[PDB]
Design a protein around this ligand. Structure first.
Ligand SMILES: [Zn+2]
Lengths: 78, 44
């Protein structure tokens, strides 16, 4: 079974990708990278008023199908 | 008092009370732009 998810950025852009329940936050960024063109080591996810990261999985944040997530880029050197 | 629909009522980043009768999208929307501006990626 494969569920779908959406991730909007601070620019308004809306990305539509698919993810699994066993997958992880970092994974969602992996595929998104080929979409927008940003590394997962810079972009992050926000849902349920909590910072979604590789530290947890999708099922950890109860991320179901058609989830409204945001995009946050925290440049290190830039 | 039937308010809620969010994991936080006040931005724990910039200590900013979110608007009432808000939604999970509202808090997250700001939490995203705030987080990006913040320097510490603490887990709240
Ligand atoms: Zn804030």
């Amino acid at each position: 079974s494969h569920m779908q998810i959406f991730v909007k950025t601070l620019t308004g852009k809306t990305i539509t990708l698919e993810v699994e329940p066993s997958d992880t936050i970092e994974n969602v960024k992996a595929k998104i990278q080929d979409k927008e063109g940003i590394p997962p080591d810079q972009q992050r996810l926000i849902f349920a008023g909590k910072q979604l990261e590789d530290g947890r999985t999708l099922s950890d944040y109860n991320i179901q199908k058609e989830s409204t997530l945001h995009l946050v880029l925290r440049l290190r050197g830039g | 008092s039937h308010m809620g629909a969010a994991a936080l009522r006040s931005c724990p980043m910039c200590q900013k009370e979110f608007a009432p009768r808000l939604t999970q999208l509202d808090v997250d929307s700001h939490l995203a732009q705030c987080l990006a501006e913040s320097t510490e990626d603490v887990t709240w």
